[PDB]
Design a binder for this molecule. Structure first.
Ligand SMILES: Cc1c(Cl)cc(Cl)c2nc(CCc3nc4cc(Cl)ccc4s3)nn12
Ligand SMILES: [Mg+2]
Ligand SMILES: [Zn+2]
Length: 312
C-alpha cells in the first residue's frame, strides 16, 4: 500500500498538458512511477522490477543536448495527460504499453538524424534501412526488458506479452517524423469521410502513431519560456550535425547550419504550420479532450510571429 505522492504544486500541475517536469533529475523516476500508478494502476507493474527497468532505461540515454532522459520523461508525461483525459478509450495493454514506449522511444540516441547515419555509413544504417534510429530504440527496449529482474510484463500471457511488445514497436517506429505526414493524411481522410473506426486495429494503430508524434513534439505545447529554451537544445543538436555534415564535405540544410541562425524564426513558422498545428488539429478532431495541446501550440506560433516582427 506504498503510494507515490508529489508536493502539492506538482500533484496539481502534472495533470495539465503544459506541465514542465523541472530541473531536478532525481525526481523524474518518481514522477514517472506516479504517472504509471494513476494511468495504469498500482497493480500494473511490480514496483521493484519497474524501478530497476526505469534506472536501466535512464543509464541507456546519453548526455546529449535534446534527445536525453529529460526528453523521454517529458514525452511520457504528455502521453499520461492524453490517457488521463480519454480514460475509457484505451485498453489495459495500451495504458501499460504506451508510457513504456514513450520512456523508451529515443533509447541510446546519439543526437544525429537517420539522414546523417546514412551519409556517414554508420553500421546501424546497414542493419535498418528505414526508420534507422527508431528500429535501434525498439531493439534497446527489448534488450533492457530481457535483463535479469527487468521483465515488468512477466504477469502477461505469451499472447498478451506479444501484443504489448507489438504496441510498443509500432508506437516507437511512429516517432520517425518521415512516417508522420502520410499517417496524418490517412487519419484526416478517414475522419472526414466518417470511415474512422476505433474497433479496427489498423485504425487504432494510426491514432496511437499520431499520439506518439503529438507527445514527441510536445515542446511546442509548453509555456513560451519552456518552448523557447527547449528550442536552444534542439538547435544545439542540429548545428552539431551540420558541423559533422561539413566534415563529410556536405553543405547541411539551413536548419542544421549554425551560420544561418538568422533563419530560425521563419523555420519555426514553417514547422508549426507544416508539422505541429496539423498534428494537434487532427488529434483534437479524433480525441476532443486533447484540444489544450492545439491551443498551446497556436499560442507558441504567435510568440514566434512576434520574434519575426522584432517585438521579442
Ligand atoms: C520545435 C521542434 C520540435 Cl518539438 C521537433 C522537431 Cl523535429 C523540430 N525541428 C525543428 C526545426 C524546424 C526548422 N528550423 C529551421 C531553421 C532554419 Cl534556419 C531553416 C529551416 C528550418 S525548419 N523545430 N523542432
Ligand atoms: Mg526519435
Ligand atoms: Zn523523441
Amino acid at each position: 500500500l506504498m503510494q507515490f505522492t508529489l508536493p502539492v504544486r506538482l500533484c496539481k500541475e502534472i495533470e495539465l498538458f503544459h506541465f514542465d517536469i523541472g530541473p531536478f533529475e532525481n525526481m523524474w523516476p518518481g514522477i514517472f512511477v506516479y504517472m504509471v500508478h494513476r494511468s495504469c494502476g498500482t497493480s500494473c507493474f511490480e514496483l521493484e522490477k519497474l524501478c530497476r527497468f526505469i534506472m536501466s532505461v535512464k543509464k541507456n540515454y546519453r548526455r546529449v543536448p535534446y534527445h536525453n532522459w529529460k526528453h523521454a520523461v517529458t514525452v511520457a508525461h504528455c502521453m499520461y495527460a492524453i490517457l488521463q483525459n480519454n480514460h475509457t478509450l484505451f485498453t489495459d495493454l495500451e495504458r501499460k504499453g504506451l508510457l513504456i514506449a514513450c520512456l523508451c522511444h529515443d533509447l541510446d540516441h546519439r543526437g544525429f538524424s537517420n539522414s546523417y547515419l546514412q551519409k556517414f555509413d554508420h553500421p546501424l544504417a546497414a542493419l535498418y534501412s528505414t526508420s534507422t534510429m527508431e528500429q535501434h530504440h525498439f531493439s534497446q527496449t527489448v534488450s533492457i526488458l530481457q535483463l535479469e529482474g527487468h521483465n515488468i510484463f512477466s504477469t502477461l500471457s505469451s499472447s498478451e506479452y506479444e501484443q504489448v511488445l507489438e504496441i510498443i514497436r509500432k508506437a516507437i517506429i511512429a516517432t520517425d517524423l518521415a512516417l508522420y505526414f502520410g499517417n496524418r493524411k490517412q487519419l484526416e481522410e478517414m475522419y472526414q469521410t466518417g470511415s474512422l473506426n476505433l474497433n479496427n486495429q489498423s485504425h487504432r494503430d494510426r491514432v496511437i502513431g499520431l499520439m506518439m508524434t503529438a507527445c514527441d513534439l510536445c515542446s511546442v505545447t509548453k509555456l513560451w519560456p519552456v518552448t523557447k529554451l527547449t528550442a536552444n537544445d534542439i538547435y544545439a543538436e542540429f548545428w552539431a550535425e551540420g558541423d559533422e555534415m561539413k566534415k563529410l564535405g556536405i553543405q547541411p540544410i539551413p536548419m542544421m547550419d549554425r551560420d544561418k541562425k538568422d533563419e530560425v524564426p521563419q523555420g519555426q513558422l514553417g514547422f508549426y504550420n507544416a508539422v505541429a498545428i496539423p498534428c494537434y488539429t487532427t488529434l483534437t478532431q479524433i480525441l476532443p479532450p486533447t484540444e489544450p495541446l492545439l491551443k498551446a501550440c497556436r499560442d507558441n506560433l504567435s510568440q514566434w510571429e512576434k520574434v519575426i516582427r522584432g517585438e521579442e
